[PDB]
Amino acid sequence: KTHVQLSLPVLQVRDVLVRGFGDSVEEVLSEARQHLKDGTCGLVEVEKGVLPQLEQPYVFIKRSDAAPHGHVMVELVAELEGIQYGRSGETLGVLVPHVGEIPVAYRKVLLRK
């Protein structure tokens, strides 16, 4: 399918144990997509002071359109040293590996895959 319904655990930034997906824009988009397929991806909501506590390159989920079955349609955009790779809508959050951190909420998304 071109889209997959996922329910992403929303993590507090200070709980996150693995603070990024890797070392290059291509690697972090690859690993983010793998962890989204495997159910091992968390979401951190972006506010003042969050991104400097995480590792670049960043992977964002961004709104791709204006929400089937309560799932916002999203796509992936990476960022490194102030340059973005992809073009999309409003940020819903930054993706990180999930390794058993307790979430505060879930974010229902329809991921363009």
Please, which experimental method was used? X-ray
Joined together, the tokens standing for residue 39 give: 């159910």
Closest among 108, 95, 104 to 34, alpha carbons compared: 95
Classify the C-alpha dihedral 37-91-43-28 as positive or negative: positive
For residues 38 and 97, is the Cβ–Cβ distance under 8 A? no
Q: 57 vs 27, 73, 77, 81, 108, CA distance in Å?
A: 9, 23, 10, 8, 24
| Contact call for residues 64 and 73 (beta carbons, < 8 A) | yes
Look at the block and give the residue holding tokens 């590996």: 97
Resolution (in Å) of the shown entry?
1.5
The CATH code of the domain that includes 58 is: 2.30.30
Structural domain boundaries enclosing 40: 3-112
Q: How far apart are CA 63 and CA 75, in angstroms?
A: 7
**DSSP of 48-83:** TTSGGGSPSSEEEEEE----GGG-EEEEEEEEETTE
- Number of structural domains the chain divides into: 1
